[PDB]
């Protein structure tokens, strides 16, 4: 299970987007016993929060998930080759760290509830 | 995250069906440490039970989910405007509380396993 963990952290973003299961499988597992239980419970809560974020974006059971949210060049004006063939996910996260919540709020409530209401109203037809 | 929590509890059911993410994001987080750990673990188990109920209805990753279960007028004979533009979800829950398990058993086993077997047998074709 642990084999290959984080091994594409120095690879390009595209090369590292082909090992997502390796890092997804490694996210789940006296006074010492309660400290370790608190660590395990926090890991569980953290996994559940991430999966809830995926589920409120229409991205459940998906390691790669496309959306209807346009990319803003204000967030990043780099070209596709620069990002996917000339950058790592760590550098990317450093670059977009101050824009993450804007994207997460454009995915959270606008796109998904709009799309979901439209599917309900199309299912009416 | 907490902003807007339960703020549509006095709004109509339709107006309150547009803020579901606000209440979905607020469902996940010595001797005192074990009491609080038990509270956190029970919150996790409760969220998992709700998500399991959604998943056995074909409603995973969905805040609004349509089904193939007809509404019975015995459960409620009210008109759509009464329910969605003239009632709150609290009053609704008060009205249907003694019919919830019938609906949940018509969603649990009939609709979903029937539909799922039919998708398997159509995938055979």
């Amino acid at each position, epitope marked *: 299970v642990f084999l290959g963990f984080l091994g594409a952290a120095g690879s390009t973003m595209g090369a590292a987007s082909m090992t997502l299961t390796v890092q997804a499988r490694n996210l789940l597992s006296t006074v010492w016993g309660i400290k370790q239980l608190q660590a395990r419970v926090l890991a569980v809560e953290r996994y559940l929060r991430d999966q809830q974020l995926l589920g409120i974006w229409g991205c459940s059971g998906k390691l790669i998930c496309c959306t209807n949210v346009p990319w803003n060049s204000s967030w990043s004006n780099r070209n596709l080759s620069e990002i996917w063939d000339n950058m790592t996910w760590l550098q990317w996260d450093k670059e977009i760290s101050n824009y993450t919540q804007i994207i997460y709020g454009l995915l959270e409530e606008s796109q998904n509830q709009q799309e979901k209401n439209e599917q309900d*109203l*199309l299912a009416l037809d | 995250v907490f902003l807007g929590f339960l703020g549509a509890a006095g709004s109509t059911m339709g107006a309150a069906s547009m803020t579901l993410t606000v209440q979905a994001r607020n469902l996940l987080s010595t001797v005192w440490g074990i009491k609080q750990l038990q509270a956190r673990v029970l919150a996790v188990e409760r969220y998992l039970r709700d998500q399991q109920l959604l998943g056995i209805w074909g409603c995973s990753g969905k805040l609004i989910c349509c089904t193939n279960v007809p509404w019975n007028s015995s459960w409620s004979n009210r008109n759509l*405007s009464e329910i969605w533009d003239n009632m709150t979800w609290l009053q609704w829950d008060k009205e249907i509380s003694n019919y919830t398990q019938i609906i949940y058993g018509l969603l649990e086993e009939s609709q979903n396993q029937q539909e799922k077997n039919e998708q398997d047998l159509l995938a055979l074709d």
Partner: antibody
Amino acid sequence: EVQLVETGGGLVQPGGSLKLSCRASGYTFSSFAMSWVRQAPGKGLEWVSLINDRGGLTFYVDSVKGRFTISRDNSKNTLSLQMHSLRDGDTAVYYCATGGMSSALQSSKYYFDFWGQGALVTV
Amino acid sequence: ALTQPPSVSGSPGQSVTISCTGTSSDIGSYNYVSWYQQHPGKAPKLMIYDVTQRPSGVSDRFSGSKSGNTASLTISGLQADDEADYYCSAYAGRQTFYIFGGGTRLTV
């Protein structure tokens, strides 16, 4: 009380671009679907386009799918129809109408209850 | 599209029955058949919806019915104002939405 007023009719040349519009007053514009229905001068009615209450479900008749575009602004209480590449069969008086579909939280509205004055497009 | 009689002739005080027969996918599949009255020179008005349902502000003289794949509008007690062009519409599905029939002149 309900009044729909169409504007933007005119004389266009085959292949031109026009933008019809309809104004509404007397009701909650954001809680009804809106449709465009055309009557050619010598023939009967024909349904052209449909838009939902919110404005994100758009339906078109087979003829005009790629050419016509329906849109609505629920703050200005205005419905619009962009018609590109107008051919010769598109000459008719266009009516903006209320109805055609509804939300899941309302009853079925498979009909047009309120119509407009009319706007003649000759092309 | 649907087929409607080109003209229907009536005399004051008696009844008249316009018809609209369609295929099995529009009228025989969906109970959503509407009738509209367009006076000469003005815009259409809703007379009947949902086969048998009547909008508020419309007299009981206008009545609707359906049998199989055929819909019928019956106007009792014909008056001068009844003279108009009458069109039947049916909801045909979510791919093709609304199909209209040709007009019908009523002469009283």
